[PDB]
């Protein structure tokens, strides 16, 4: 009441799975399931790692954020492809870093060139892509096509 609506980011946990195979995972977070996460992408290896994931709203219920981040902070795994879609709301930034700052080392961010930002999702850029993934962060405002 007096607080004015207030709630906490949900971060739910799972695996990464190599073998040159394309998987996907989503979540939804508040009632109606206004707010929807997916992640698809597809590596190569023979080692499995635990991946966080952390989904933000506004109070308004007008912003939303969708963060994905590497536990040690650096991916041992190969990327060939990865994709971000996000539904309930428009994607208004899109950040990536292929290497997590330790300690004394700065975090190293990729460039824009590097991958591809669309209205409703982003899709790595071919040729361009080093194959890094290690942490990813979205922003989008909450909207509403209504037919």
Known sequence: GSKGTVSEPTTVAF???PGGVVHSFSHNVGP?????????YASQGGTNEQWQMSLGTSEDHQHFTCTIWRPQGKSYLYFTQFKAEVRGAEIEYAMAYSKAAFERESDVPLKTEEFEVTKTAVAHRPGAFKAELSKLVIVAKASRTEL
Do not use: A, E, I
Request: aromatic share 16%; with cysteine; glycine share 8%.
């Open 32 to 40: 109606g399931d206004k707010y929807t996460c997916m992640f698809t």
């Open 15 to 17: 695996d990464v799975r």
